[PDB]
Structures are given as structure tokens and as C-alpha cells.
Homo-oligomer: A and B are copies of this chain.
Amino acid sequence: GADGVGNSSGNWHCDSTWMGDRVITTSTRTWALPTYNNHLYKQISSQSGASNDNHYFGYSTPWGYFDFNRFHCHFSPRDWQRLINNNWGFRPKRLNFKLFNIQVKEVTQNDGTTTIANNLTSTVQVFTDSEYQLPYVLGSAHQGCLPPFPADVFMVPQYGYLTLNNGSQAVGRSSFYCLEYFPSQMLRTGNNFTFSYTFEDVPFHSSYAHSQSLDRLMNPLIDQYLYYLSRTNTPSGTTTQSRLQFSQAGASDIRDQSRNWLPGPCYRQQRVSKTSADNNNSEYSWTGATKYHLNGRDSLVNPGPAMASHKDDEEKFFPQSGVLIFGKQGSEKTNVDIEKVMITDEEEIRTTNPVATEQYGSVSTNLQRGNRQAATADVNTQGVLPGMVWQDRDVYLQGPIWAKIPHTDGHFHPSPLMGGFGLKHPPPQILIKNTPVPANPSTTFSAAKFASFITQYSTGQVSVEIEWELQKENSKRWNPEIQYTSNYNKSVNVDFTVDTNGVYSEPRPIGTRYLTRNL
């Protein structure tokens, strides 16, 4: 579609429709794109004496990009509530992406006055890779996503990537990608950009919590037919001789009953308390953290495998890194106090998954004999064993929607750690750039490259439409469920609403597990 200068290239669509099998969410925002790096690529690398773990080597590019990968882009807090309360599962099906009403502005800064004028003949160039030939940045939980609240205007983030490094020095295998080298549609004012995308078949996300736990999956009324060792020694009344005896497990001792399944795997965490008095006084943020080790550099495992955050009535404590932590509106980047952050809580997974701060179990250390006593050891890390079941981490409201499974010889249970849908072919990246306009070349010829350009930026609207598939809840539970409810009491401000200054805010993380299924 190519219109004139005065025709509008596309309408505003921000909507949600519910067909009861499907929900189709649409959102439209206004974006503003500057020129990054003065129209030129650069390499960037870890600064000077940065620690061995912090070294990196990569390139920054003039290009920007769009990321809708956060849920709250697509769902309003009320739309999120219909889904969360009424449904067992959901997955995306197909999406559509449309750019329109582009306009490019040249700015002239003279003295203190800056005049911003339309540049009608300038262009903006956009491409979507869709063959996945670029480093895929999305899914790293970077900022720059479409704003939660539709009236916001957002700046388009700059695109950059990292490659192999030794220290800050590059390695011969490190790749350099020139984004100018791909076919891209060039858009002048009165052109629009579109593409549609179809998600590959993916398991539903589970929005339900279990009403039973692995430990307690059996009829309390009836005894098992399987014996266990109830006791190992019997008294002679002067001394206790060694005689081993057996019992059928039943309501009296539940812990001894033969069970047919095992909890999910654990990689242990350190426990810290929200009350500042209970925590130790030392710097253990790093030396005490749980880490993994590649190529001689440690990396904190922030998300971790999916685990319950705390046991019964422990709500005070939370794992050191083991949870997602969101900031409240207007929170600074660094060294911000506990009251500012919003800490998510996974306790709905207690049933099938171990508590992140405690060990999987205990294991016999040695072979007993008449002269030596039996001994056991604690298993702080457990890989997958046959017959283990587990729940995936919850997606919440502002968490990421998807991630790209790396392309590798093998991978186990592709579901991402931060939550969301593992996608082998995720939604492609959309990269956008202001085409350079030179400024007043010299009359004599010079073979050097231009250092002078017209200063300009562009703006327009972006529209994303995703189609979601729903899994309805059919259950015979007699008594009421738990629902997500906005509190009835009065308040100065309404939750999920602008304040007197016009600042939209999200009071708490909303995770998707309320409705209950039996295990």
C-alpha cells in the first residue's frame, strides 16, 4: 500500500475479542526512532580491567528493532483476568504485524533554538529476517518493549550483539554481520509495512495449580499390600539385638508408603529473608551465590530451574537468585532497596517441585556392617531421573512471552527458564533504520566517506495482533476456586491506573496460576 502525502496509511487498532475458543489481542503504539552511532557500526568490548567474568566483545549497529515479547503489551489487566481466572491453558497461534503513518522529521539546531520540520522525501528502511540469520536478541528480557499502557510513546532500542572473545580480544571465529547487507523495504511517508507469522505447534502453558501433591496421592483408608522395613532391631531387655521387621504402610505412617513418582530436579539456592534482621551480615551476594562455569568464567544462574520458593508458612524467605524480581514504577537501575522491587513467589509449585532453598533428599553414604553404623549424605543437586515430574515456571503478567531454543545437537525439555514458550522458530526480528541523508558535499571530489549528515528522526505507529488459543476448565470441584480479585477497600489510587500526575503503574506481579486441577 502506497498512499499520498495526505492520505492516512493505516487505522488505529487496539482491541481484544473473545470467541471463546480463541482470544485475539491487538495493540497499537506510537514509536520514535533516532539515529544511533552516527549512522555507523562500531565494535564494543569490556572496559579495561573488568573482571574475567565480565569480558565481552561485540558490535553496536545503527539499526533499531521492535520487541513486543512482554505479555502486558498484548493484555490489559482486565483482559489478563478473564484468561487467568477462566482457563487452564493458553498458547499463541498466529500473529500479524503492521507499520503505518510513518513520518520523518529533520531537526536544525542553531543557537539555542531548534526547529523541527517535515522532511517529505526522506525514507525509512525496515526488514524482518525470518530466516534467523542474525544473532537473536529477543528473549533476553531487555527493556524497550512496547509500553504497558497504550497512551505511552516509546523510543525504539538500538540493536547490538556479542560474539566469541578471549579477554576483550576477538577470536577468529567471531562473526561480523552487516545489516545493510539484507533486502529491506524502504518506506517513505505514505508507505506501510506488514507481515504475518504463524507459531509452530507448542504445548499449552499450564495456568492451573494442583490440588494434590506427589507425596500424598493415595487412598488413606486402605492399606498397601507392599511391606517396608518398619524397624531394624528388637530388644532382649538387657540389650537390643539386631532383628529386622516389616510392615504394610497405611494411614498411620504415610511417609513409608511406596510411591510411584519422584519430584522434579533441583539445583540448590541460598535462602535470604525479606526482614533485614534475619540475614547474615557479610557480602555473600557473589561468593555465596549459586553459579555455573563455562570456559573459565562463572555466571550467576539467576532464573534457575523451576522450584518452589519456600515451604509452608515461610513466606518471609525467598531464594537468593531463584526468583524473578520486577521493579516498581520509577525504580532506579542500581542498588535499590527491597521496598522498591516486586519479588515474585512460586509457592504454587510446592506439590510437584522441591523447595529451591533445601536439598532434594538424603542418600546412603556407606555400606553398613555389624561393626560400623550406617551413614547418609545430603543431595544438594539432582539431575533428571526416570519417573520424575515437574512444573514449569510461571509466566506472570510482565514476564516474557517466548524464547528461541538454541540450534544445537541436543536439548532437554526446551521450555525456557524465565518462563514462556520455547520456540524453535520464534517471531522474527523487525529491524528499522533512518536512511542517511548527506549534507552539502564539497564541490571538489573527495574519495573519503561522508562525516556530515542531516540530523533527523522518524516516528509512526506500530500494530501487533496475536491470536491465542485457550484450554477451557472442566472440573467437578464442589467448593469455590481462588480468583484474582482487586481489593474492595478504599484507596487513594486505583491499582493498575494512572495517578494524579499521569504515571501508569503496576502494583504487583500477576502470575497465571489460580484455577486448580487435581494431580
Contacts and interface: CB of A to CB of B under 8 A. Distances in A.
Contacts of A285: 229-232
Interface stretch (A112-120, A387-395, A433-441): A387-395
A493 B383 contact: no
A416 to B, nearest CB: 5
A135 to B, nearest CB: 5
A477 B233 contact: no
Interface stretch (A95-103, A218-226, A460-468): A218-226
Interface string A76-106: 1110110001000000000000000000000
Given A141-B258, A215-B294, A133 B476 contact: yes
A242 B355 contact: no
Contacts of A385: 265, 267, 305, 383-384, 412
Contact of A227 (B160, B206, B214, B326): B326
19 contacts: A40-B502, A45-B500, A133-B474, A140-B218, A141-B258, A144-B222, A170-B490, A177-B477, A181-B478, A227-B326, A243-B276, A262-B292, A265-B383, A272-B368, A288-B374, A357-B364, A383-B384, A388-B411, A390-B411
Given A81-B481, A246-B336, A321 B228 contact: yes
Given A170-B494, A485-B482, A387 B246 contact: no
Contacts of A163: 211-212
B293 A358 contact: yes
Interface string A394-414: 000010000101111111111
A297 to B, nearest CB: 7
A196 interface: no
A142 B218 contact: yes
Contact of A483 (B42, B203, B403, B485): B485
B411 A389 contact: yes
Contacts of A413: 386-387, 410, 412
A496 interface: yes
Copies of this polypeptide in the complex? 3
Contacts of A267: 363, 385
Nearest to A65: B219
A382 B380 contact: no
Contacts of A518: 134-136, 175
Given A38-B502, A363-B380, 19 more contacts: A78-B475, A134-B476, A159-B219, A164-B211, A172-B486, A173-B211, A174-B494, A176-B498, A177-B477, A214-B294, A226-B324, A245-B338, A247-B335, A258-B418, A260-B417, A295-B312, A305-B386, A407-B517, A482-B486
A125 interface: no
Nearest to A338: B244
B364 A229 contact: no
A484 interface: yes
Interface centre among A54, A244, A295, A499 (most CB of B within 10 A): A295
A217 interface: yes
Contacts of A133: 474-476
A447 interface: no
Given A173-B211, A303-B260, A497-B43, A229 B321 contact: yes
Interface stretch (A5-13, A22-30, A56-64, A187-195): A56-64
